């Protein structure tokens, strides 16, 4: 009935706002269809490394983006007060609707 998409670049972290959200639900109202992993999209930026010439040098960086699902089935006005006002985690992105 309400699922919250979750994404941040750091993994030893995103599953901590995950298992915080999930926990700050079951304890309260509850339900939550467990936290789903979901395809972590990984951008890859590879660029020349030398100030000038040497096209064979280059650095190969990446940016892993991790997802988590949530899905809470029983919206208890209490669990609503539990998502709200029990949260934070600066580097994580939350999406309440779809």
């Amino acid at each position: 009935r309400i699922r919250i998409r979750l994404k941040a670049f750091d993994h030893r972290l995103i599953d901590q706002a995950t298992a915080e959200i999930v926990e700050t639900a079951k304890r309260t109202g509850a339900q939550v269809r467990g936290p789903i992993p979901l395809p972590t999209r990984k951008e890859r930026f590879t660029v020349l490394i030398s100030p000038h010439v040497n096209k064979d040098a280059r650095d190969q960086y990446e940016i892993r983006t991790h997802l988590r699902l949530v899905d809470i089935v029983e919206p208890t006005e209490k669990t609503v007060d539990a998502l709200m006002r029990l949260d934070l985690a600066a580097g994580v992105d939350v999406q309440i609707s779809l």
Binding site: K7, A8, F9, D10, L88, A90, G91, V92, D93
Partner: protein
Amino acid sequence: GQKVHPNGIRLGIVKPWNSTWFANTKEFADNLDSDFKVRQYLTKELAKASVSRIVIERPAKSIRVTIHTARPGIVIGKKGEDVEKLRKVVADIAGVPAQINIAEVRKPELDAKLVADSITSQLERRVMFRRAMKRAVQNAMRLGAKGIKVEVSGRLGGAEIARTEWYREGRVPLHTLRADIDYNTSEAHTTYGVIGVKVWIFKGEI
């Protein structure tokens, strides 16, 4: 010129990241620059505030800004003033609003950037480059540092023909990824040229 940046290669492990925030392309752009603008303005301001490292994080529609200094009460000013005149224009630059956090730098002789900056600050005062390096090195082995090394570069003292001269004392495994290594960088703008400092400080493992 063939060593991997020591901080860089660590990140994944043992070394943090001086921007934690998340953004999705569309704003990743403007964001990155906003950062540059805060670390720019704040560095020229807190120049003589022995600032070692400035972290930034935007949490939803906010920018926090943390400031690692070794003279907190200079950054803070009279019971809270300086922090304001900063915060103010820091939140002004980034557009969105901003708090600000002054982290205290424990045992600065261990902070690479703060070491380099001194070696720099001194060369421009006009002091013996050899002496300074050697002083720096000690005060670190003194306070623990299971290793350190500083090197300078070019027109060292005067030399029309440019040198480098390093100085490793202790242990410095720039290959062991576990190794806590604090590597930073400072250039000195002299009357005879531009001398560049690199300091490594080896602190342990795991």
